[PDB]
Ligand binder design. Structure first.
Ligand SMILES: O=C(N[C@@H]1c2ccccc2-c2c(-c3cnc4ccccc4c3)cccc21)c1c(Br)cnc2[nH]cnc12
Length: 207
């Protein structure tokens, strides 16, 4: 397990999201399902030139898994996945410019709900989660676990868990006052309103 520091602005945005009074928190799901669809679009497109890219799994789907006992909501996809370089360096480059523009826009009057237009919709997870664990597997790298409770740092380690084949698991360890996102009725209602036309099957698991 390696520990990394976020740059001042990104830690400032994460703190903005984790704190700040904003009631419309449900938009986090739309954002993560959108990141999942983007990842599925990427692997599917890559496979068009190289079909061996789907040897790691052919099914292209999104699963939404609530767990009342662990107080978690997992968003699972079988997309492109992320390499160690992505988790540490490349996505850090994306998160830097995107944070700058979103912070500029927020000051100018833009809403927290517009986060996805700046390519940092992933951080909207912190509207409902006190900790986010990302389990991911790209064809070109090993299975990794990324994790942050915000607070200015994140960790990356090789993941010893169940092999995923290919894709991403975004585990949301929800805040104690955000357990409504564990209810079937609530998740269904959010999926219909914001994510009804995603081009991949979304299965809402139950308990
Ligand atoms: O959205 C995706 N990734 C996320 C994303 C988007 C934009 C900017 C950063 C990140 C990020 C970081 C991160 C965040 N901040 C950082 C800041 C500094 C350094 C490294 C950092 C790393 C860590 C884990 C996951 C993601 C994503 C991808 Br792609 C592929 N398949 C998926 N399926 C579902 N989601 C995804």
């Amino acid at each position: 397990m390696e520990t990394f520091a976020f740059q001042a602005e990104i830690a400032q945005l994460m703190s903005l999201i984790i704190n700040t009074f904003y009631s419309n928190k449900e938009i986090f799901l739309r954002e993560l399902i959108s990141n999942s669809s983007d990842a599925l679009d990427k692997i599917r497109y890559e496979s068009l030139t190289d079909p061996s890219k789907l040897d790691s799994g052919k099914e292209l789907h999104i699963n939404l898994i609530p767990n009342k006992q662990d107080r978690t909501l997992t968003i699972v996809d079988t997309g492109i996945g992320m390499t160690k370089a992505d988790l540490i360096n490349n996505l850090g480059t994306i998160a830097k410019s995107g944070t700058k523009a979103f912070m500029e826009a927020l000051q100018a009057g833009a809403d927290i709900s517009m986060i996805g237009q700046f390519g940092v919709g992933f951080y909207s997870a912190y509207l409902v989660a006190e900790k986010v664990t990302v389990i991911t597997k790209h064809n070109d790298d090993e299975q990794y676990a990324w994790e942050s409770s915000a607070g200015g740092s994140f960790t990356v380690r090789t993941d010893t868990g169940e092999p995923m084949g290919r894709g991403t698991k975004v585990i949301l360890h929800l805040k104690e006052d955000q357990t409504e996102y564990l209810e079937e009725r609530r998740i269904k209602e959010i999926v219909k309103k914001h994510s009804q036309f995603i081009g991949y099957p979304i299965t809402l698991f139950v308990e």
